[PDB]
Design a protein around this nucleic acid. Structure first.
Lengths: 117, 54, 112, 122, 209
RNA sequence: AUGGUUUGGCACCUCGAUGUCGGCUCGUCGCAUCCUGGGGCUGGAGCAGGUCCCAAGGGUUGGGCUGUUCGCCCAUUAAAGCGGCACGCGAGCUGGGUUUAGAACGUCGUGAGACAGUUCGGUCUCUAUCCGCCGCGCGCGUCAGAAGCUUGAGGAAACCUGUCCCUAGUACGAGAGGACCGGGACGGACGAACCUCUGGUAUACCAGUUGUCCCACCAGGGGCACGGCUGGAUAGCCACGUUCGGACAGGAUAACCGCUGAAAGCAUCUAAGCGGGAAACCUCUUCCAAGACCAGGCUUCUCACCCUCUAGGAGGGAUAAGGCCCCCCGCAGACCACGGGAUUGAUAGACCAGACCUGGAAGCCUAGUAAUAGGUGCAGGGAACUGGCACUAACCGGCCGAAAACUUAC
């Protein structure tokens, strides 16, 4: 999606890519994760488009997701329940909740989760 | 460059008074019945039970 | 494409379908001391930069030992008619590598 | 775009093969010479039996440029080399034969003889 | 001098009858409603005030709504003043009268006024076109700095040094109106007019041509 | 006679430190004017000059040689001005020259050594306190609290110029040559705005490919190697690109040309007066501008409710119009500010569609021994642009914020 206007997240583009892929993996594995608010803000569109690929689940879309996720159990869950669960919802698969600031560096924290309504 | 002169007390205090912290605004919320103050940025999280209230 | 209502008034139909790689001859009207004539430019379409009204295409030809490139707006009224001779078989969208090739190496496969 | 210390091939049969641009005539502190501009040039390479000699300071006109040049009607013309034709003060070629195509800009600049002598004008 | 408020839409390409290309900027000279007359006997200067843009009535604050009601017209987003020369010139406008695009004619010369794009904090190289220092031959960390600042040991006022750039009202003079499309209220102005797409502009008859 | 721009003379200033030449970058001022502007006499026929008055608005090139300034030269140009400001500018840069220690040549000295003689090499430190200057905010003020739109005292910016075409090959001139005045087009340099075109860039785009490791394996992919390397590359930013600008007109004038005429019966552009007269000056063009303390103007909105001391004034509280914070954002941005949205919603994301970029996905089938090719199929993939769509987030919310009166006149 839209590339970051400013400097990258992990300190380099490759690190940011790895960070985003890992964060999406954890999100789909657990259902909600807690991280710094810029990280969740950057994570929303990425995970939403992976879920979009999973919604129309074909071999081509499966390979498209695997070229980013790298974790086969997570891919299986994504194409077995997460995809079919959001069959009749058009976008907005995730929501962001702002939570209390971190203690060590006062970094704004936020919790990103999948909607289950 | 190095300071050529020692600052007088008036100038030092006048510049130093700008280094201050602002008070966050707090709004009321009902968690487990009891009313308590929370920043409005954390209102939804408090309503969802995601912030520790001591 | 908000400016589309403005654009379509000047948009020009009858334009043949062609792609980078085809060999075409462009009938270009010129002015030679206040009289009209059509000068035909026959060459290889090496690029096409889509813009709607601002669409441009580039035709490259070899003439008297010097390569020449000409860029025309696709909907330019200065072009009375474009005729496509052959269809070329290429793997790119822009054929800039042809600027360094002469004669035998500069040939283009034919779509059969 | 031809400027000082730039090298151009000669599209004539004067015996000169290659010239170096010394000045771009047409106004003080002028920078670039396009198609149809007159430059002061010095001959760097010459045919051994030609009429001109190395180190002659001559006047030439640019007839081809690598940098594409816009035209009034929004079309562009681009060649593969920078070429010049040596002229005299009356804007006629010092040679008798022009090699390779030339641009249409030589018409509005009143280089009628060069245009007529050229194999083809684009 | 005629005038109108408009909006910059973008730039495109057209061809005139000699087949030459004309790069034209599209300006939405939308309908303007005259809201107030400035008169010498009342304000000391003669000018006419125009309103432009469409806005929801629940967005206007009470003072603005009261002013528009006193005028007798429904509120608009933007308000601006056109300064005329004398009462004979301003006699031809009256409150509630609607100005549209056809006040201009083909081939007319106009003066577009807009707010330039923002460029942020800019160095002297970009803000003022300062030539840089050498990138090699020993130059030490001076590749882009202004250099000297130059008896009283004082930096004279007006020093062209770095600072914020852009975001200023700019007038471009003697632009030719290639076409006045009356159906869409669109002016086709040959050239580039200041500001970003969707910004407010003022189109006035040229003061020089 | 001027000046302290040249060498000087003095030693008043600094030895408990005032960087020494050129060059780069950036200036500012003078006019003793190089071009452009207005003039006059010409030993001025016209052209072109000579010389001289006014005139400082703008402009005043790129290279070769030398460390150089200086200077000579090469091409141009309308022109390639002369100077002041620590012979401007090293807490802005350089270190080529000069000015430490190494070494050599010539010369001087018995010698250590020396030479306003030469030659090669040879550390240029610093986090900006104050003034100054460029930008940006916070507070208060402008006699109630607010909000729109503005006048402008006063400042700032800009001011360059060529060639060609008509008039006219006429005036003049033995001829050659060669016009005045006035219109038009196209240029050079400089500046501003902009991204339709051209071109550059592209660290979440598409494709190709090398080495290696992994996804059990094939297929298909992924990590690392400058984004591994290559071919393209929309948006944004930009110039090498596009468009526009220097005006026109008025006023007072300079050198100057004059009109009407005294003292001084004539004369005298003058002491009274009245006119013409320049890129200089004032307006005119663009921009900032009411902290312009004389703190402006035209409007519009709220236009009211308590408590306390002692009723004099004050203090406190709660409100209106409105604003801010929190929130969603921006092509606005260091922060701040600015601008837009906030469920009565298209502000951002997602989703759908289009535009555009790439260039024919996977799987399957067919052909080939295989490399690989064809069909399915303008395929698949995808960011910025555009239009739809409340699916997700803009929230059952906090803080600020409105009137002593008097005098005179009507």
């Amino acid at each position: 999606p839209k590339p970051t206007k400013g400097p990258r997240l992990g300190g380099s583009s490759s690190h940011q890519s790895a960070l985003l892929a890992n964060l999406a993996t954890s999100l789909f594995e657990h259902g909600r994760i807690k991280t710094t608010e810029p990280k969740a803000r950057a994570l929303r569109p990425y995970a939403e488009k992976l879920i979009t690929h999973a919604k129309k689940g074909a071999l081509h879309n499966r390979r498209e997701v695997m070229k980013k996720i790298r974790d086969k159990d997570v891919v299986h869950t994504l194409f077995a329940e997460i995809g079919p669960f959001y069959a009749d919802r058009n976008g907005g698969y995730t929501r962001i909740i702002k939570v209390e600031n971190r203690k060590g560096d006062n970094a704004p924290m936020a919790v990103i989760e999948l909607v289950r309504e | 460059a190095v300071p050529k002169r020692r600052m007088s007390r008036a100038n030092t205090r006048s510049r130093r008074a700008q280094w201050k912290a602002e008070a966050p605004g707090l709004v009321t919320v009902s968690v487990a019945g009891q009313q308590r103050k929370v920043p409005r940025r954390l209102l939804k999280a408090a309503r969802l039970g995601l912030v520790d209230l001591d | 494409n908000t400016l589309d209502f403005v654009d379509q008034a000047s948009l020009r139909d009858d334009i043949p379908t062609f792609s980078p790689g085809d060999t075409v001859n462009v009938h270009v009207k010129v002015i030679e001391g206040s009289k009209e004539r059509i000068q035909v430019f026959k060459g290889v379409v090496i690029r096409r930069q889509g813009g709607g009204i601002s669409e441009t295409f580039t035709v490259r030809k070899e003439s008297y030992g010097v390569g020449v490139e000409r860029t025309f707006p696709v909907h330019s009224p200065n072009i009375d008619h474009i005729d496509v001779l052959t269809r070329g078989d290429v793997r790119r969208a822009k054929l800039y590598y042809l600027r360094e090739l002469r004669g035998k190496k500069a040939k283009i496969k034919e779509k059969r | 775009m031809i400027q000082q210390e730039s090298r151009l091939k000669v599209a004539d049969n004067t015996g000169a093969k290659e010239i170096l641009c010394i000045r771009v005539l047409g106004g003080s502190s002028r920078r670039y010479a396009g198609i149809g501009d007159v430059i002061v040039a010095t001959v760097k390479d010459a045919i051994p039996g030609g009429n001109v000699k190395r180190g002659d300071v001559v006047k030439a006109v640019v007839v081809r440029t690598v940098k594409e040049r816009r035209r009034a009607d929004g079309s562009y013309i681009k060649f593969d080399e920078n070429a010049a034709v040596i002229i005299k003060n009356d804007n006629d070629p010092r040679g008798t034969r022009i090699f390779g195509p030339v641009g249409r800009e030589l018409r509005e600049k009143k280089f009628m003889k060069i245009v007529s002598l050229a194999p083809e004008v684009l | 001098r005629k005038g109108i408020l408009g909006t910059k839409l973008g730039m495109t390409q057209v061809f005139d009858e000699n087949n030459k290309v004309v790069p034209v900027t599209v300006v939405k000279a939308g309908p303007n409603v005259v809201t107030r007359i400035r008169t010498t006997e009342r304000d000391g200067y003669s000018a006419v005030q125009l309103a432009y843009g469409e806005i929801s009535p629940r967005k206007v604050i009470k003072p603005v709504a009261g002013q528009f009601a006193a005028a007798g017209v429904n509120p608009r987003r933007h308000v601006a003043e056109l300064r005329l020369d004398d009462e004979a010139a301003v006699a031809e406008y009256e409150v509630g009268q609607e100005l549209t695009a056809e006040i201009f004619s083909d081939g007319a010369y106009v003066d577009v006024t807009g707010t330039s794009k923002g460029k942020g904090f800019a160095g002297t190289m970009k803000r003022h076109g300062f030539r840089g220092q050498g990138a090699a031959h020993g130059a030490q960390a001076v590749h882009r700095r202004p250099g000297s600042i130059g008896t009283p040991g004082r930096v004279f006022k007006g020093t062209r040094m770095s600072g914020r750039m852009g975001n200023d009202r700019v007038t471009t003079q003697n632009l030719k109106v290639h076409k006045v499309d009356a159906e869409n209220g669109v002016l086709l102005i040959k050239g580039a007019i200041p500001g970003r797409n969707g910004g407010l502009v003022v189109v006035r008859s040229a003061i020089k041509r």
